[PDB]
Amino acid sequence: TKQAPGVSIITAEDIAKRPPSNDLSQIIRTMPGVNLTGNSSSGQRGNNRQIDIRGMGPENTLILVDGKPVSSRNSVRYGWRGERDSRGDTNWVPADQVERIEVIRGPAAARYGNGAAGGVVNIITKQAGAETHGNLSVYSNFPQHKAEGASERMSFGLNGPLTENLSYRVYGNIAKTDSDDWDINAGHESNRTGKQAGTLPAGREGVRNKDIDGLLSWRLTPEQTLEFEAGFSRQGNIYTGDTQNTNSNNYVKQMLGHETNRMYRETYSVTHRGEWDFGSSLAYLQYEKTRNSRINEGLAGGTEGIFDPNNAGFYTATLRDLTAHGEVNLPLHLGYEQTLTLGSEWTEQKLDDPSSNTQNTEEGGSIPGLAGKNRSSSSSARIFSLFAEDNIELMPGTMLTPGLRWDHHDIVGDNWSPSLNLSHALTERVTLKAGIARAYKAPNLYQLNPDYLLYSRGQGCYGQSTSCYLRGNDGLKAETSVNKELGIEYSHDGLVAGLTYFRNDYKNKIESGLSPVDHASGGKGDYANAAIYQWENVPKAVVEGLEGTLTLPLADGLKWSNNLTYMLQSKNKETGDVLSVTPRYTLNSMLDWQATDDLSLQATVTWYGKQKPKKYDYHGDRVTGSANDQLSPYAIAGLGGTYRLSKNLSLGAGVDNLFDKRLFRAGNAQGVVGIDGAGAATYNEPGRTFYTSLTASF
Ligand SMILES: [Fe+3]
Structure with missing residues (x-):
C-alpha cells in the first residue's frame, strides 16, 4: 500500500489525480505527520511555507532527488x-x-543523518526502460478571484537506449505561478497607524521555473552500472510587497511585479551501481552550485529583511555543496537471517554571502573579536560519516534493524546517532512497529559564523528594551532528537487501518539567545554599549502527536482513503512557547471512483484544526490584543477527473476549494510599533480555482 507506520509513498498516479499547481509541497503535505509551516513562530515570510514532518520544522526536513541532497x-x-x-x-x-x-x-x-530529525522527502524521477518512451504534460489553473495568482506548467520527458549498455533520460520544464496582487490582503491587514499606516502584509510570491536534466546510464558489464547526470534550474520570483516585518519603503513599491530574487541551481552527479553474488553496491558524487541573486536588504531591527535603498542593487550569494556517498549491502546467514549495509558519507558546504556579514557596530558600539567592516563573506563545514545498518529476520515476518551512524563535523565535533527499528507480525493482517533513534542536526553556516551579526535598538531584544546584537557562535552543539514512534496497522484486501504515536525529545535546538553573554563598547546615544546575544542551544524541547490512515474499498471501482495528523504538543521547554505553528489536526479524505474503464473521478476534503500563535513576543513578554488571534478550524473540498482519450492521451479537469473558503495574511504574529500583530493569521489560503491538464505519452 501507500501508508505503513512512519512511511508514505506518493505515486505518479496520485500526482496525476490531485495535480499540484507548481510546487510538490501541495501534495507532499497531505501525507500523515506532514504540515506546511514556517520554521519558528514569528509568522515572518509566512506565505513562504515549507514541508514540516511531525512539527520538527522544515530545516529538519531533508529533501533528496533520486537519493541526492538538495541544499539550495x-x-x-x-x-x-x-x-x-x-x-x-x-x-x-x-x-x-x-x-x-x-x-x-x-x-x-x-x-540519513544531517537534517533528517523531522524526516526525509525523496523525490524520485522517471527513468528510461528497455525501449524509448517520452511524455508531454501541460497544466493550467484559473482562480475565481483575480487577486490570487494562476499557475501554468509545461514539461516533457524522453528516455530509452542508445547502445546495448547505454541508456539516457532527459526532461525539461517551463512553469509560472503569478504572484497574488499587491492588494489581496487589503481590508484584512492588522491595524497599522502612524508611519506604518497604509502598509500591507503580502500574498504569495510568484515564481518562474526553467528545469533541464540530462542523464546517461552506462552498464559497462553485467554487474556494473555508471550514471552521469547534469541539472540546470532557474527560479525568478514575482515580488508582491513581502518584507520581514510587513513595513514598506519606496524601493519595495518600485519592485512590485518585478524579479527581486533569482536562484540558479546547477547539479552534476556521477553514480556507480553494483550487483553481484555477495550483494549490492552504490556510490555517488554530487556537486550542487546555487547562485542566490537578490536585492540587498538591511540587517538591523525593523530594517531586517526589507530592500535597503542606501545600497540599491543585486548581490549574489553562492553555495557550493559537494556530496559523496558509499554503501555496500550484504546478505548474511547465521543463527539469525540478516542483511548488513556498510557506508561512508562526505559533504562540504561552502557559502559565499557578500551581504549577510556587513552589519556594522557604530550605533551599538564595537564587539571585541568582530571587525566592523570588510568581514569575510565565507563559511564552510565538512561532515565525515560512517554507518552500518543490520536488517535482522528473527522469525519470518519479524525484522529487528539496529544501525550506528557516527559523524565528524569539523567545527562542532563528533556525533553518535544510534537507531533501532522493530516491525512485528502479530497476525497475517496486523503488524506492530516500534522505533527509537537519536537524529542529528548540524548548525547552519549562519548560526555557526561569529561574523554574522544582526542588530536591534531594543524591540527585538529578549528581556530588555536596550540596543542588542545577535551573533553567530562556533561554540554551538549540534541539535539531537530522540524520535520515539509506536504504531499498529491492519492491512488486508486493500482494507488498511493504522494509528501511530510519535514523540521526539529535542535537545539543543539552536535559536536566538535569551541572556546577554557580553556588552559591546562605544557608539551613539542611548544605543551605545549594546548587549550581545549569540545563537544558543536550547536544552530541551518536545513534539508529540498521532498519525492515522484508514482505506476502505466501498465497491470494486470505489476507494475511500483518509490520512490523519494530530499534534498533541510542540514546546520549547525553556520559554514554554510553541516551536512551529501547525493546525491541531489535519484530515485528508479522498473518494476515488473508477466510473469507467476510461473515466476516473476524485472528490477530496481536507479539514484543518485550530491554529494558536506564540504566547510571548521577542522581549519574552506576553502578547496582547490581535497578537492572540487564533484561526478557527476550516475545510477545503475539491472534485476532479481524468478522462483517458487513448493509451497515448489523457485529459484532467477539476475544482480546488469548491466552497471558496479563503484566508488572508494580516501580518506577522506579534505587534511592533505602528503594526499590530495578526496572531495565527500569517498566510493566504487561496479560494475556488478551476484547473485543466493534458498528458500525451508513448
Ligand atoms: Fe528597532
Missing part, C-alpha cells in the same frame, strides 16, 4: 527568528516527471 535554501540568509526568505526546496523537479515521492518520518529517517 542554505544559500538564503537565516534570520533572527529562524526563517529564510526562501520558497523551500520542493519546486526543483516538475510534478509530471516524478515517478514517486518517498516520505520517511522519525526514527526510520535518522540513518
Whole structure:
C-alpha cells in the first residue's frame, strides 16, 4: 500500500489525480505527520511555507532527488527568528516527471543523518526502460478571484537506449505561478497607524521555473552500472510587497511585479551501481552550485529583511555543496537471517554571502573579536560519516534493524546517532512497529559564523528594551532528537487501518539567545554599549502527536482513503512557547471512483484544526490584543477527473476549494510599533480555482 507506520509513498498516479499547481509541497503535505509551516513562530515570510514532518520544522526536513541532497535554501540568509526568505526546496523537479515521492518520518529517517530529525522527502524521477518512451504534460489553473495568482506548467520527458549498455533520460520544464496582487490582503491587514499606516502584509510570491536534466546510464558489464547526470534550474520570483516585518519603503513599491530574487541551481552527479553474488553496491558524487541573486536588504531591527535603498542593487550569494556517498549491502546467514549495509558519507558546504556579514557596530558600539567592516563573506563545514545498518529476520515476518551512524563535523565535533527499528507480525493482517533513534542536526553556516551579526535598538531584544546584537557562535552543539514512534496497522484486501504515536525529545535546538553573554563598547546615544546575544542551544524541547490512515474499498471501482495528523504538543521547554505553528489536526479524505474503464473521478476534503500563535513576543513578554488571534478550524473540498482519450492521451479537469473558503495574511504574529500583530493569521489560503491538464505519452 501507500501508508505503513512512519512511511508514505506518493505515486505518479496520485500526482496525476490531485495535480499540484507548481510546487510538490501541495501534495507532499497531505501525507500523515506532514504540515506546511514556517520554521519558528514569528509568522515572518509566512506565505513562504515549507514541508514540516511531525512539527520538527522544515530545516529538519531533508529533501533528496533520486537519493541526492538538495541544499539550495542554505544559500538564503537565516534570520533572527529562524526563517529564510526562501520558497523551500520542493519546486526543483516538475510534478509530471516524478515517478514517486518517498516520505520517511522519525526514527526510520535518522540513518540519513544531517537534517533528517523531522524526516526525509525523496523525490524520485522517471527513468528510461528497455525501449524509448517520452511524455508531454501541460497544466493550467484559473482562480475565481483575480487577486490570487494562476499557475501554468509545461514539461516533457524522453528516455530509452542508445547502445546495448547505454541508456539516457532527459526532461525539461517551463512553469509560472503569478504572484497574488499587491492588494489581496487589503481590508484584512492588522491595524497599522502612524508611519506604518497604509502598509500591507503580502500574498504569495510568484515564481518562474526553467528545469533541464540530462542523464546517461552506462552498464559497462553485467554487474556494473555508471550514471552521469547534469541539472540546470532557474527560479525568478514575482515580488508582491513581502518584507520581514510587513513595513514598506519606496524601493519595495518600485519592485512590485518585478524579479527581486533569482536562484540558479546547477547539479552534476556521477553514480556507480553494483550487483553481484555477495550483494549490492552504490556510490555517488554530487556537486550542487546555487547562485542566490537578490536585492540587498538591511540587517538591523525593523530594517531586517526589507530592500535597503542606501545600497540599491543585486548581490549574489553562492553555495557550493559537494556530496559523496558509499554503501555496500550484504546478505548474511547465521543463527539469525540478516542483511548488513556498510557506508561512508562526505559533504562540504561552502557559502559565499557578500551581504549577510556587513552589519556594522557604530550605533551599538564595537564587539571585541568582530571587525566592523570588510568581514569575510565565507563559511564552510565538512561532515565525515560512517554507518552500518543490520536488517535482522528473527522469525519470518519479524525484522529487528539496529544501525550506528557516527559523524565528524569539523567545527562542532563528533556525533553518535544510534537507531533501532522493530516491525512485528502479530497476525497475517496486523503488524506492530516500534522505533527509537537519536537524529542529528548540524548548525547552519549562519548560526555557526561569529561574523554574522544582526542588530536591534531594543524591540527585538529578549528581556530588555536596550540596543542588542545577535551573533553567530562556533561554540554551538549540534541539535539531537530522540524520535520515539509506536504504531499498529491492519492491512488486508486493500482494507488498511493504522494509528501511530510519535514523540521526539529535542535537545539543543539552536535559536536566538535569551541572556546577554557580553556588552559591546562605544557608539551613539542611548544605543551605545549594546548587549550581545549569540545563537544558543536550547536544552530541551518536545513534539508529540498521532498519525492515522484508514482505506476502505466501498465497491470494486470505489476507494475511500483518509490520512490523519494530530499534534498533541510542540514546546520549547525553556520559554514554554510553541516551536512551529501547525493546525491541531489535519484530515485528508479522498473518494476515488473508477466510473469507467476510461473515466476516473476524485472528490477530496481536507479539514484543518485550530491554529494558536506564540504566547510571548521577542522581549519574552506576553502578547496582547490581535497578537492572540487564533484561526478557527476550516475545510477545503475539491472534485476532479481524468478522462483517458487513448493509451497515448489523457485529459484532467477539476475544482480546488469548491466552497471558496479563503484566508488572508494580516501580518506577522506579534505587534511592533505602528503594526499590530495578526496572531495565527500569517498566510493566504487561496479560494475556488478551476484547473485543466493534458498528458500525451508513448
Ligand atoms: Fe528597532
